[PDB]
Design a protein around this ligand. Sequence first.
Ligand code: 3K3
Length: 253
Amino acid sequence: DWEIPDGQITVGQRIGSGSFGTVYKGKWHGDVAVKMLNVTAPTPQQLQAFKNEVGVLRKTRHVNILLFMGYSTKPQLAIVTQWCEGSSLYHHLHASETKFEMKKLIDIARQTARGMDYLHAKSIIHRDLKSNNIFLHEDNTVKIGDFGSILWMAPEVIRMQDSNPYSFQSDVYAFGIVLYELMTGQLPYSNINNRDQIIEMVGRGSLSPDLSKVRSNCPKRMKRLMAECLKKKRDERPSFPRILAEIEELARE
Ligand SMILES: O=C1CCc2c(Oc3ccc4c(c3)[C@@H]3[C@H](O4)[C@H]3c3nc4cc(C(F)(F)F)ccc4[nH]3)ccnc2N1
Protein backbone atom coordinates (compact mmCIF):
# COMPACT_ATOMS: atom_id res chain seq x y z
CA ASP A 1 0.00 0.00 0.00
CA TRP A 2 1.05 3.63 -0.62
CA GLU A 3 -0.49 5.20 2.49
CA ILE A 4 1.99 7.15 4.64
CA PRO A 5 1.26 6.97 8.41
CA ASP A 6 0.83 10.20 10.36
CA GLY A 7 4.00 11.70 11.79
CA GLN A 8 6.36 10.11 9.29
CA ILE A 9 6.53 13.24 7.16
CA THR A 10 8.19 16.36 8.60
CA VAL A 11 6.44 19.09 6.63
CA GLY A 12 9.13 21.68 5.99
CA GLN A 13 9.03 24.84 3.88
CA ARG A 14 5.95 26.13 2.06
CA ILE A 15 6.61 26.51 -1.67
CA GLY A 16 3.33 27.59 -3.22
CA SER A 17 -0.05 28.49 -1.81
CA GLY A 18 -3.34 28.21 -3.67
CA SER A 19 -6.97 28.74 -2.67
CA PHE A 20 -7.42 24.99 -3.14
CA GLY A 21 -4.30 23.57 -1.52
CA THR A 22 -0.67 24.21 -0.59
CA VAL A 23 2.62 22.64 -1.75
CA TYR A 24 5.25 22.16 0.95
CA LYS A 25 8.77 20.86 0.51
CA GLY A 26 9.19 18.04 3.02
CA LYS A 27 11.49 15.38 4.43
CA TRP A 28 10.72 11.65 4.35
CA HIS A 29 13.63 9.26 3.74
CA GLY A 30 15.21 12.19 1.94
CA ASP A 31 13.77 15.32 0.36
CA VAL A 32 10.18 15.11 -0.85
CA ALA A 33 7.37 17.47 -1.82
CA VAL A 34 3.95 17.32 -0.24
CA LYS A 35 0.74 18.87 -1.62
CA MET A 36 -1.81 19.40 1.15
CA LEU A 37 -5.48 20.39 1.22
CA ASN A 38 -6.22 23.52 3.29
CA VAL A 39 -9.41 21.99 4.73
CA THR A 40 -9.77 20.16 8.04
CA ALA A 41 -12.75 18.02 7.08
CA PRO A 42 -13.01 17.77 3.25
CA THR A 43 -16.36 17.43 1.42
CA PRO A 44 -16.89 14.16 -0.53
CA GLN A 45 -16.64 16.26 -3.73
CA GLN A 46 -13.03 17.15 -2.85
CA LEU A 47 -12.47 13.92 -0.94
CA GLN A 48 -12.17 12.10 -4.22
CA ALA A 49 -10.62 15.08 -5.93
CA PHE A 50 -7.82 13.58 -3.86
CA LYS A 51 -8.78 9.92 -4.34
CA ASN A 52 -8.86 10.35 -8.12
CA GLU A 53 -5.60 12.26 -8.43
CA VAL A 54 -4.02 9.43 -6.44
CA GLY A 55 -5.35 6.75 -8.78
CA VAL A 56 -3.98 8.37 -11.92
CA LEU A 57 -0.72 8.89 -10.06
CA ARG A 58 -0.17 5.32 -8.82
CA LYS A 59 -0.64 4.18 -12.41
CA THR A 60 2.51 6.03 -13.49
CA ARG A 61 6.10 4.78 -13.37
CA HIS A 62 8.05 6.74 -15.98
CA VAL A 63 11.23 8.82 -15.95
CA ASN A 64 9.39 11.81 -17.40
CA ILE A 65 6.39 11.82 -15.07
CA LEU A 66 6.52 13.26 -11.55
CA LEU A 67 7.28 10.38 -9.20
CA PHE A 68 4.38 9.54 -6.91
CA MET A 69 5.69 8.20 -3.59
CA GLY A 70 2.61 7.98 -1.39
CA TYR A 71 -0.26 9.89 0.21
CA SER A 72 -1.32 10.99 3.68
CA THR A 73 -4.88 10.92 5.01
CA LYS A 74 -4.41 12.53 8.43
CA PRO A 75 -4.41 15.23 9.65
CA GLN A 76 -5.14 16.73 6.24
CA LEU A 77 -5.20 15.03 2.84
CA ALA A 78 -1.81 15.13 1.16
CA ILE A 79 -0.08 13.86 -1.98
CA VAL A 80 3.63 13.03 -1.72
CA THR A 81 6.01 13.20 -4.68
CA GLN A 82 9.74 13.31 -5.28
CA TRP A 83 11.40 16.69 -4.73
CA CYS A 84 12.46 18.26 -8.03
CA GLU A 85 14.95 21.12 -8.12
CA GLY A 86 15.17 23.98 -10.60
CA SER A 87 12.62 25.78 -12.77
CA SER A 88 9.74 24.92 -15.09
CA LEU A 89 10.15 25.12 -18.85
CA TYR A 90 8.04 28.29 -18.71
CA HIS A 91 10.31 30.07 -16.25
CA HIS A 92 13.21 29.08 -18.50
CA LEU A 93 11.82 30.28 -21.85
CA HIS A 94 9.65 33.27 -20.93
CA ALA A 95 10.61 34.53 -17.47
CA SER A 96 14.36 33.98 -17.75
CA GLU A 97 16.50 34.52 -20.84
CA THR A 98 17.65 30.89 -20.98
CA LYS A 99 20.22 30.64 -23.78
CA PHE A 100 18.89 27.25 -24.83
CA GLU A 101 20.69 25.35 -27.60
CA MET A 102 18.97 23.51 -30.44
CA LYS A 103 20.10 20.05 -29.36
CA LYS A 104 18.62 20.64 -25.90
CA LEU A 105 15.39 22.18 -27.20
CA ILE A 106 14.86 18.98 -29.23
CA ASP A 107 15.75 16.87 -26.20
CA ILE A 108 13.19 18.67 -24.01
CA ALA A 109 10.66 18.13 -26.81
CA ARG A 110 11.73 14.49 -26.96
CA GLN A 111 11.49 13.86 -23.20
CA THR A 112 8.05 15.51 -23.15
CA ALA A 113 7.11 13.28 -26.09
CA ARG A 114 8.17 10.14 -24.23
CA GLY A 115 6.37 11.34 -21.12
CA MET A 116 3.12 12.17 -22.88
CA ASP A 117 3.40 8.98 -24.90
CA TYR A 118 3.49 6.94 -21.69
CA LEU A 119 0.38 8.64 -20.28
CA HIS A 120 -1.67 7.93 -23.39
CA ALA A 121 -0.81 4.23 -23.41
CA LYS A 122 -2.09 4.09 -19.84
CA SER A 123 -5.16 5.87 -21.24
CA ILE A 124 -4.49 9.07 -19.27
CA ILE A 125 -5.55 12.43 -20.71
CA HIS A 126 -3.64 15.24 -19.02
CA ARG A 127 -6.11 18.09 -19.76
CA ASP A 128 -3.50 20.77 -18.96
CA LEU A 129 -0.24 20.27 -20.82
CA LYS A 130 1.74 23.53 -20.80
CA SER A 131 5.26 24.91 -20.39
CA ASN A 132 4.88 25.62 -16.65
CA ASN A 133 3.38 22.18 -16.06
CA ILE A 134 6.67 20.78 -17.41
CA PHE A 135 9.37 20.86 -14.74
CA LEU A 136 13.05 20.84 -15.77
CA HIS A 137 14.50 18.81 -12.89
CA GLU A 138 18.18 19.69 -12.50
CA ASP A 139 17.59 21.73 -15.66
CA ASN A 140 17.83 18.44 -17.58
CA THR A 141 15.35 15.75 -16.66
CA VAL A 142 11.80 16.61 -17.75
CA LYS A 143 9.11 15.86 -15.20
CA ILE A 144 5.51 16.21 -16.37
CA GLY A 145 2.77 16.86 -13.81
CA ASP A 146 0.19 19.28 -12.42
CA PHE A 147 2.26 22.04 -10.74
CA GLY A 148 -0.51 24.60 -10.26
CA SER A 149 -3.83 28.63 -19.68
CA ILE A 150 -5.91 29.31 -22.81
CA LEU A 151 -2.84 29.54 -25.03
CA TRP A 152 -2.58 25.73 -25.08
CA MET A 153 -6.30 25.08 -25.50
CA ALA A 154 -7.33 23.60 -28.85
CA PRO A 155 -10.13 25.32 -30.81
CA GLU A 156 -12.65 22.61 -29.84
CA VAL A 157 -11.68 23.01 -26.19
CA ILE A 158 -12.10 26.80 -26.32
CA ARG A 159 -15.63 26.22 -27.64
CA MET A 160 -16.39 23.61 -24.95
CA GLN A 161 -18.33 21.56 -27.53
CA ASP A 162 -20.72 19.30 -25.58
CA SER A 163 -19.45 18.38 -22.10
CA ASN A 164 -15.81 17.28 -22.20
CA PRO A 165 -13.84 18.40 -25.28
CA TYR A 166 -10.69 17.09 -23.60
CA SER A 167 -9.25 14.16 -25.54
CA PHE A 168 -5.95 12.63 -26.66
CA GLN A 169 -5.88 15.13 -29.50
CA SER A 170 -6.40 18.04 -27.12
CA ASP A 171 -3.14 16.99 -25.50
CA VAL A 172 -1.59 16.66 -28.93
CA TYR A 173 -2.58 20.25 -29.77
CA ALA A 174 -1.16 21.48 -26.47
CA PHE A 175 2.07 19.58 -27.17
CA GLY A 176 2.41 21.49 -30.42
CA ILE A 177 2.19 24.76 -28.54
CA VAL A 178 5.02 23.47 -26.34
CA LEU A 179 7.00 22.77 -29.53
CA TYR A 180 6.09 26.29 -30.61
CA GLU A 181 7.62 27.65 -27.42
CA LEU A 182 10.75 25.56 -27.85
CA MET A 183 11.10 26.35 -31.56
CA THR A 184 10.23 30.06 -31.57
CA GLY A 185 11.21 31.12 -28.08
CA GLN A 186 8.09 33.07 -27.21
CA LEU A 187 4.44 32.25 -26.54
CA PRO A 188 1.85 32.16 -29.32
CA TYR A 189 -0.42 35.17 -29.93
CA SER A 190 2.39 37.48 -28.84
CA ASN A 191 0.86 40.45 -30.64
CA ILE A 192 -2.78 39.96 -29.64
CA ASN A 193 -3.08 41.73 -26.28
CA ASN A 194 -6.44 40.56 -24.93
CA ARG A 195 -7.41 37.22 -23.37
CA ASP A 196 -11.00 37.62 -24.54
CA GLN A 197 -9.75 38.30 -28.05
CA ILE A 198 -7.79 35.03 -28.13
CA ILE A 199 -10.81 33.04 -26.93
CA GLU A 200 -13.18 34.50 -29.54
CA MET A 201 -10.86 34.40 -32.55
CA VAL A 202 -9.53 30.87 -31.97
CA GLY A 203 -13.12 29.79 -31.36
CA ARG A 204 -14.00 30.75 -34.93
CA GLY A 205 -10.66 29.65 -36.41
CA SER A 206 -9.79 33.23 -37.33
CA LEU A 207 -6.63 33.04 -35.25
CA SER A 208 -3.75 30.57 -35.07
CA PRO A 209 -0.06 30.62 -33.99
CA ASP A 210 2.40 32.46 -36.26
CA LEU A 211 4.69 29.68 -37.56
CA SER A 212 7.01 32.17 -39.26
CA LYS A 213 8.50 33.09 -35.88
CA VAL A 214 10.59 29.96 -35.28
CA ARG A 215 14.38 29.90 -35.03
CA SER A 216 16.35 29.60 -38.28
CA ASN A 217 18.07 26.38 -37.26
CA CYS A 218 14.65 24.90 -36.50
CA PRO A 219 14.80 21.50 -38.27
CA LYS A 220 12.21 21.28 -41.05
CA ARG A 221 10.87 18.00 -39.65
CA MET A 222 10.04 19.78 -36.39
CA LYS A 223 8.55 22.78 -38.25
CA ARG A 224 6.08 20.44 -39.99
CA LEU A 225 5.29 18.19 -37.01
CA MET A 226 4.47 21.42 -35.18
CA ALA A 227 1.97 22.29 -37.90
CA GLU A 228 0.50 18.79 -37.79
CA CYS A 229 -0.07 19.04 -34.04
CA LEU A 230 -1.91 22.33 -34.56
CA LYS A 231 -4.42 21.20 -37.18
CA LYS A 232 -7.68 22.86 -36.26
CA LYS A 233 -9.66 19.61 -36.56
CA ARG A 234 -8.92 17.10 -33.77
CA ASP A 235 -8.88 14.04 -36.03
CA GLU A 236 -6.17 15.49 -38.29
CA ARG A 237 -3.60 15.59 -35.48
CA PRO A 238 -0.94 12.85 -35.11
CA SER A 239 -0.94 10.44 -32.18
CA PHE A 240 2.06 10.39 -29.82
CA PRO A 241 3.69 7.14 -31.05
CA ARG A 242 3.90 8.85 -34.46
CA ILE A 243 5.30 11.92 -32.72
CA LEU A 244 7.78 10.13 -30.46
CA ALA A 245 9.06 8.26 -33.53
CA GLU A 246 9.53 11.42 -35.61
CA ILE A 247 11.23 13.46 -32.87
CA GLU A 248 13.51 10.65 -31.73
CA GLU A 249 14.47 10.04 -35.37
CA LEU A 250 15.63 13.62 -35.91
CA ALA A 251 17.19 13.84 -32.43
CA ARG A 252 19.70 11.21 -33.56
CA GLU A 253 21.83 13.81 -35.37
O1 3K3 B 1 10.32 23.79 -6.91
C1 3K3 B 1 9.42 22.97 -6.96
C2 3K3 B 1 8.05 23.34 -6.42
C3 3K3 B 1 6.96 22.47 -7.03
C4 3K3 B 1 7.42 21.03 -6.94
C5 3K3 B 1 6.53 20.02 -6.62
O2 3K3 B 1 5.21 20.33 -6.39
C6 3K3 B 1 4.24 19.36 -6.22
C7 3K3 B 1 4.15 18.68 -5.00
C8 3K3 B 1 3.17 17.71 -4.79
C9 3K3 B 1 2.29 17.46 -5.83
C10 3K3 B 1 2.36 18.14 -7.02
C11 3K3 B 1 3.34 19.10 -7.25
C12 3K3 B 1 1.31 17.67 -7.96
C13 3K3 B 1 0.61 16.57 -7.15
O3 3K3 B 1 1.26 16.57 -5.86
C14 3K3 B 1 1.58 16.20 -8.27
C15 3K3 B 1 0.86 15.69 -9.47
N1 3K3 B 1 1.48 15.02 -10.46
C16 3K3 B 1 0.59 14.67 -11.40
C17 3K3 B 1 0.73 13.98 -12.60
C18 3K3 B 1 -0.37 13.75 -13.40
C19 3K3 B 1 -0.16 12.99 -14.69
F1 3K3 B 1 1.14 12.98 -14.97
F2 3K3 B 1 -0.79 13.57 -15.70
F3 3K3 B 1 -0.57 11.73 -14.58
C20 3K3 B 1 -1.63 14.21 -12.98
C21 3K3 B 1 -1.77 14.90 -11.77
C22 3K3 B 1 -0.65 15.13 -10.97
N2 3K3 B 1 -0.46 15.76 -9.77
C23 3K3 B 1 7.00 18.71 -6.55
C24 3K3 B 1 8.35 18.46 -6.80
N3 3K3 B 1 9.18 19.46 -7.10
C25 3K3 B 1 8.74 20.74 -7.18
N4 3K3 B 1 9.59 21.76 -7.49
